[PDB]
Amino acid sequence: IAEPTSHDPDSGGHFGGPSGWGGRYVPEALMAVIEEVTAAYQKERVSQDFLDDLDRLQANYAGRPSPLYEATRLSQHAGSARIFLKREDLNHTGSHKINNVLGQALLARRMGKTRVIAETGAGQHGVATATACALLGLDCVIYMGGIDTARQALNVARMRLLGAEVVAVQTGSKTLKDAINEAFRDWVANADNTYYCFGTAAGPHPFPTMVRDFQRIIGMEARVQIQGQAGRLPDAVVACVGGGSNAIGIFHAFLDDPGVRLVGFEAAGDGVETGRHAATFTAGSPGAFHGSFSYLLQDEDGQTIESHSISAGLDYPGVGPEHAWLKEAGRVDYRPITDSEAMDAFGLLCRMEGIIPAIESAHAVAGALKLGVELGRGAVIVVNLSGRGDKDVETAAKWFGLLG
Amino acid sequence: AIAEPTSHDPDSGGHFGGPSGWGGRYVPEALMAVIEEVTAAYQKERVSQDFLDDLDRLQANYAGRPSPLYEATRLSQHAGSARIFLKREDLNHTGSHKINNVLGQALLARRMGKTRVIAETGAGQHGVATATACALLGLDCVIYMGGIDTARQALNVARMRLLGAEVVAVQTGSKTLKDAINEAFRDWVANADNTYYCFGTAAGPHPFPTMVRDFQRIIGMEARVQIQGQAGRLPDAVVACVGGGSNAIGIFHAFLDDPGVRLVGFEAAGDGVETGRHAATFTAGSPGAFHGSFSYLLQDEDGQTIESHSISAGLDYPGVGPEHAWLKEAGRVDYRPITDSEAMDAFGLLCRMEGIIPAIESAHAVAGALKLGVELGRGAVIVVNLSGRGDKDVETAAKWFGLL
Amino acid sequence: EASRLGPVFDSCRANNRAALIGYLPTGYPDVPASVAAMTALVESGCDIIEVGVPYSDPGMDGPTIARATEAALRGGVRVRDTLAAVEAISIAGGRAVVMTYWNPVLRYGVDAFARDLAAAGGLGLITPDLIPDEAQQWLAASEEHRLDRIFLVAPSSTPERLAATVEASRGFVYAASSQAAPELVGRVKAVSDIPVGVGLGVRSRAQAAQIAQYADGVIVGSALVTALTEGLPRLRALTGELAAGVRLG
Amino acid sequence: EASRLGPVFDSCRANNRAALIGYLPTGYPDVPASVAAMTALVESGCDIIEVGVPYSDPGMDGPTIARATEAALRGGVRVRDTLAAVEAISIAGGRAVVMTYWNPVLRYGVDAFARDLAAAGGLGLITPDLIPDEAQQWLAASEEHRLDRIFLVAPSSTPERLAATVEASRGFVYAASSQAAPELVGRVKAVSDIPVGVGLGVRSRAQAAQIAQYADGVIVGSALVTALTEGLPRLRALTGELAAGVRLG
Numbered sequence A: 001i002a003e004p005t006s007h008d009p010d011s012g013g014h015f016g017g018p019s020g021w022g023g024r025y026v027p028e029a030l031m032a033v034i035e036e037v038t039a040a041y042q043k044e045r046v047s048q049d050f051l052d053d054l055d056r057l058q059a060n061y062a063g064r065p066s067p068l069y070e071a072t073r074l075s076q077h078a079g080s081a082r083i084f085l086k087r088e089d090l091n092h093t094g095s096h097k098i099n100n101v102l103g104q105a106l107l108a109r110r111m112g113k114t115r116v117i118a119e120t121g122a123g124q125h126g127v128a129t130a131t132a133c134a135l136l137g138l139d140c141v142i143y144m145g146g147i148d149t150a151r152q153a154l155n156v157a158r159m160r161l162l163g164a165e166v167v168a169v170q171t172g173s174k175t176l177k178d179a180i181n182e183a184f185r186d187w188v189a190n191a192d193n194t195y196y197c198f199g200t201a202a203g204p205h206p207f208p209t210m211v212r213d214f215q216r217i218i219g220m221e222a223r224v225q226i227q228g229q230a231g232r233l234p235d236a237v238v239a240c241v242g243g244g245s246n247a248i249g250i251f252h253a254f255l256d257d258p259g260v261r262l263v264g265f266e267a268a269g270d271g272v273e274t275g276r277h278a279a280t281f282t283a284g285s286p287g288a289f290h291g292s293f294s295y296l297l298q299d300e301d302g303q304t305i306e307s308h309s310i311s312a313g314l315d316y317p318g319v320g321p322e323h324a325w326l327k328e329a330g331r332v333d334y335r336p337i338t339d340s341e342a343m344d345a346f347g348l349l350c351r352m353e354g355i356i357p358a359i360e361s362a363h364a365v366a367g368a369l370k371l372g373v374e375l376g377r378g379a380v381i382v383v384n385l386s387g388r389g390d391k392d393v394e395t396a397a398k399w400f401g402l403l404g
Numbered sequence B: 001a002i003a004e005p006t007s008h009d010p011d012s013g014g015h016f017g018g019p020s021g022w023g024g025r026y027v028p029e030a031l032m033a034v035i036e037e038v039t040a041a042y043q044k045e046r047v048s049q050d051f052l053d054d055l056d057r058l059q060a061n062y063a064g065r066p067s068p069l070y071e072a073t074r075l076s077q078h079a080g081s082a083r084i085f086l087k088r089e090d091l092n093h094t095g096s097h098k099i100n101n102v103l104g105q106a107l108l109a110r111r112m113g114k115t116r117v118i119a120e121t122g123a124g125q126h127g128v129a130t131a132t133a134c135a136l137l138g139l140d141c142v143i144y145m146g147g148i149d150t151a152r153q154a155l156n157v158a159r160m161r162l163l164g165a166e167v168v169a170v171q172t173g174s175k176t177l178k179d180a181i182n183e184a185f186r187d188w189v190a191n192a193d194n195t196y197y198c199f200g201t202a203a204g205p206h207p208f209p210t211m212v213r214d215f216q217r218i219i220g221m222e223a224r225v226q227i228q229g230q231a232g233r234l235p236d237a238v239v240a241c242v243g244g245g246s247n248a249i250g251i252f253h254a255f256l257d258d259p260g261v262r263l264v265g266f267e268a269a270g271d272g273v274e275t276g277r278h279a280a281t282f283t284a285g286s287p288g289a290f291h292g293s294f295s296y297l298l299q300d301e302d303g304q305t306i307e308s309h310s311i312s313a314g315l316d317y318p319g320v321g322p323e324h325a326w327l328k329e330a331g332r333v334d335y336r337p338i339t340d341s342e343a344m345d346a347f348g349l350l351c352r353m354e355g356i357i358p359a360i361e362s363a364h365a366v367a368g369a370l371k372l373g374v375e376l377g378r379g380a381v382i383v384v385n386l387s388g389r390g391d392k393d394v395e396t397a398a399k400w401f402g403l404l
Numbered sequence C, D: 001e002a003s004r005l006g007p008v009f010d011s012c013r014a015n016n017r018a019a020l021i022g023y024l025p026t027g028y029p030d031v032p033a034s035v036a037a038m039t040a041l042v043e044s045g046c047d048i049i050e051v052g053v054p055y056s057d058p059g060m061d062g063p064t065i066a067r068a069t070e071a072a073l074r075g076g077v078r079v080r081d082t083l084a085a086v087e088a089i090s091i092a093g094g095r096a097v098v099m100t101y102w103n104p105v106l107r108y109g110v111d112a113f114a115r116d117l118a119a120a121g122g123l124g125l126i127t128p129d130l131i132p133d134e135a136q137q138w139l140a141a142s143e144e145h146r147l148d149r150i151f152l153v154a155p156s157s158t159p160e161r162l163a164a165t166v167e168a169s170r171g172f173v174y175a176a177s178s179q180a181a182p183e184l185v186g187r188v189k190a191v192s193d194i195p196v197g198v199g200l201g202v203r204s205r206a207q208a209a210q211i212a213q214y215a216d217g218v219i220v221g222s223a224l225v226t227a228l229t230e231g232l233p234r235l236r237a238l239t240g241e242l243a244a245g246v247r248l249g
């Protein structure tokens, strides 16, 4: 039933020591509802009836398991390595986000919450949240940076058709980190009745662990599929890293396979030397940010440096604490991928395999091409295709001169 | 399982129902060489294990089959307490059932040594599917699309171009699906020796009605297994929307010899069948020859095609496939009209009740399922083909519900 | 026994020339003007008149005829106007066949349309989207009412299908479309002596002369529509030039 | 030994009055002007000044303070400017504590910042996003450098967490939060004698007088920034009214 607790943090939410990564950097005003969510999740994560409810929705409603497709036509552009795409782009709503949302929305229902709020950057987590709230009869309010509502407008409209109120956030950089700030403000004001459905493997305990646990299904399936299709464990598993939910979800099943390399690719925007990027591990340093102790882009006084990326889902100056722990431990390598590298990979996946990826996922495809050259002929590389690019079609068409 | 022919097949000339003469080949002699070539190649490869293996492999690992069957319990109160089961073709790669037929025909085009694939498209879903398979198999691709459909399905125009397909906007006639078919026909006549015509619906001259249905049979075969496993018995009714008839014939066919299973197709009635702005081919049409087959069409007293109108690009077609005309004459299937308003109501209801944004085409089938549930009563089991997802329709729906 | 267009082609081989087969669509730019234009074709040297039934989806027609037939339908042309045009042509001395897509015939009734076409003085039917494989009703109606049946062959026609198509035809065979046009006629000449009409976007006296050297009939349609659009006098002149070209060979 | 702010509250409770605790962010509208305004606070009867460190992502601040801190950061405010503000406040005979989000302290170094704040004359640190569960370093630096540590309690605090948060505080407990405010103070009094300050969107003398009935200190922040935005004389006037409100006799 439930997977082991080997890589989990302590009861305070710390990875790698009682004052290590993670924790709870929140006001006391939220500690009641946070302890309540932590207790609700601790109870339900070991309940077979809760796991049965989640499994039932994943199979018949979300369409799991997602397939594993060998993208043979990519091989010659990746040093003749073999690229396998974990097809989360085929999940209901079009991304991995639905995995975590289905678990948290069932939880919100088990707790008797009637109102659900969430932040969103690319709009995939917002759409998924609005999707489950429609499914379960919950009132839904999504917070989204004003810049993101303009470049992911397809998802704004999807959320509204699903009955959710979308609030455009105008403060700060008007992107993901600022939608999170407004969702935070909403939650302390409405702790009594509102569940906060957080979309990535970050934030205060228990969210890094709960989100990873709901995304573990990706890596569990992929580990079985790759052994059936390639006959062995992969040489590498790779994913893009914003807050870290899709990467940790596919990484986790391979953590104890000492021969399986793990690489996360973060967004480098114009370039890491330009100050217009989101390369949290490449250019950031440890600190407290958005309820956890992890890496973030911060200046000399500890003020957050605003991130930039063509990808709204990776345009985030922070990263989840379990990734910080895995980096410090040397288990996972994190590398930057630029806007141009991602869009090259985007277009290459389109014309070679007929798959239109999310621009977020294109960062992981781009990194796998580079990694395939490093590993060379025959190497088996599993790539998490975290979502499809319907939301990015307008942006991609302009980039490639297909609208003028 | 397309190697085994059924007792519902047409004769060698493509005629259904013996003396009634549904189907056939109403094409100029200039296409008979390639039409016979396509017919011979289909009959050869449909029993080749190498071909069946290639198609099964792509359906599983690339397209995401099987699609799940989902009991939409939140719809039950709106369907006379009947049990509505949604066959989730909206979760297929590219977002509709069209990929089933396209993967079969694109592989066949490759087997025949054709170097160029053309296709018509109305909603843009068949165009995206064709463009997708041609990018995967490295074929040149040209899509014909009516100028009105390029405007109201603009998302799919841009997806096709990103996939490397050329898109020709058709400005003649009604500038919709039937006019795109006229233009693709003219292309094939000029370029027959190297071009494969990947036709997207269950109409046209023999072999296309039978071949398209055969590639879509997988829907009903899966659904018949899934409903027996989930519900414990065969359904009381299987319903689907009907444009040319491919998604309906694909889910109907496995149930044809189950005499207790009602089969209901729902066609687009536009502004209403009494308004002359509809696509209710069976409700208001009559027998005749049109687009290579003898079937039903909207036609005036001299036999001129009457232009169809529907809010749905995919159903905006004045014809229908010949096997449906045969099934209607035999009384095996009933065909009923659904208006724009009825479909859009079902559109919004599915959004708010189940968190699924349907194609406006599929919303016609949901609308008819609701009315059939009130007919059949509590506990009746109704399987509905949810043919596609509504990403392409989000703008149209948002304007309809005033969410702009 | 013999075809209805037999005497016309025989008289052309005697006069050492090919037949001039002219197409005009009924109702362009209106029904009276089109009938006046078809009468002008008879007086200006057209041996055979193809009276075109305008169709709503004429995929086989080029842009000149497709836009003319489309304008005729906007003007309200009906199928009965084609039968009235056939009668006017027969009364004026000409020899008329009808070229139509098949669904208007189906809606009329295959037998009833052949009956009314015969009664109007029509001599045959050109069926571009009807192949013999589907021509059961039409073969019966063609025999009953003594009408010629002009099917189309194409450069891509297989040897088997070209033979079956020629065998099913009466009057002449329409060789629809470089050496491809003479090659197609030769393949027909190798299996039958039936006259062969060639349509090839003929526009000038010279082009008509070239085709007259190997074809039994020269088919002009798009150019006649283009001429009539300029004016009835322009149609009369172009037809006279085409009548000269078919006599040179 | 007693807390660095123990004397102030002892002197206030003897005078039958609450302490007036005033917040102003450093660098608003600029660094010199903000130090002038904090000086005026001391001159106008503010017993304790809360020197605010502007933060890039102040999730717990209302629109008034959030706009001010954004402007201060655009003007280039630094953490070291907050240490200079504490020096000036100590020099004018005032008493300063720093209110700050925790990450600027981590980037500075918890021990280094507690050392330099104590050196500058600071009396304590208010940590709105630091709970005692994560305050191991800060508890060590607080005892080492003799700084008060003001944690927050909320109306939603569980009995176990309120007791633990009160036990961890030195100086006073910030009771942040219309019957919720006195009920929260009562829950703190039931377990400890530590002074309790109340924040409540105070903007008038009347409200400050209502709070001084049950609270040991009246905390004002948003109203002071608003008054400062209008002008330094408006600030002194409002502070005078607030100083009158906290006094009962």
Ligand SMILES: C=C(NCc1c(COP(=O)(O)O)cnc(C)c1O)C(=O)O
Residues within 6 Å of the ligand: A095, A096, A097, A119, A120, A121, A122, A123, A124, A125, A126, A176, A199, A200, A201, A240, A241, A242, A243, A244, A245, A246, A247, A312, A313, A314, A358, A360, A361, A386, A387, A388
């Ligand atoms: C930020 C949002 N999405 C991030 C995202 C990411 C990055 O999120 P992770 O939490 O790093 O997995 C990857 N792929 C897709 C398709 C995404 O949409 C959002 O939709 O709110």
Ligand SMILES: C=C(NCc1c(COP(=O)(O)O)cnc(C)c1O)C(=O)O
Residues within 6 Å of the ligand: B096, B097, B098, B120, B121, B122, B123, B124, B125, B126, B127, B177, B200, B201, B202, B241, B242, B243, B244, B245, B246, B247, B248, B313, B314, B315, B359, B361, B362, B387, B388, B389
């Ligand atoms: C016309 C096409 N659409 C038809 C369509 C239909 C109706 O086509 P059928 O062939 O009748 O199934 C139903 N559902 C969806 C999602 C569709 O896109 C097209 O995409 O070219």
Ligand SMILES: O=S1(=O)C[C@H](O)[C@@H](N2CCN(c3ccccc3Cl)CC2)C1
Residues within 6 Å of the ligand: A025, A026, A027, A030, A180, A181, A184, A187, A196, A198, A202, A203, A204, A207, A288, A289, A290, A291, A292, D057, D058, D059, D060, D101, D128, D129
């Ligand atoms: O007090 S703050 O200004 C400083 C603190 O870092 C801010 N974060 C950001 C929001 N957040 C959070 C994230 C994911 C899920 C749930 C939550 Cl509560 C924790 C607190 C507010």
Ligand SMILES: O=S1(=O)C[C@H](O)[C@@H](N2CCN(c3ccccc3Cl)CC2)C1
Residues within 6 Å of the ligand: B026, B027, B028, B031, B181, B182, B185, B188, B197, B199, B203, B204, B205, B208, B289, B290, B291, B292, B293, C057, C058, C059, C060, C101, C128, C129
């Ligand atoms: O001769 S026409 O003008 C009258 C006839 O209805 C036209 N249709 C058009 C469509 N076409 C077709 C449809 C689907 C797949 C393949 C094909 Cl070839 C056959 C012929 C040309």
Ligand SMILES: [K+]
Residues within 6 Å of the ligand: A241, A242, A243, A266, A267, A278, A279, A280, A314, A315, A316, A317, A318, A319
């Ligand atoms: K990041």
Ligand SMILES: [K+]
Residues within 6 Å of the ligand: B228, B229, B232, B233
């Ligand atoms: K059973």
Ligand SMILES: [K+]
Residues within 6 Å of the ligand: B230, B231
């Ligand atoms: K069940």
Ligand SMILES: [K+]
Residues within 6 Å of the ligand: B242, B243, B244, B267, B268, B279, B280, B281, B315, B317, B318, B319, B320
């Ligand atoms: K129809």
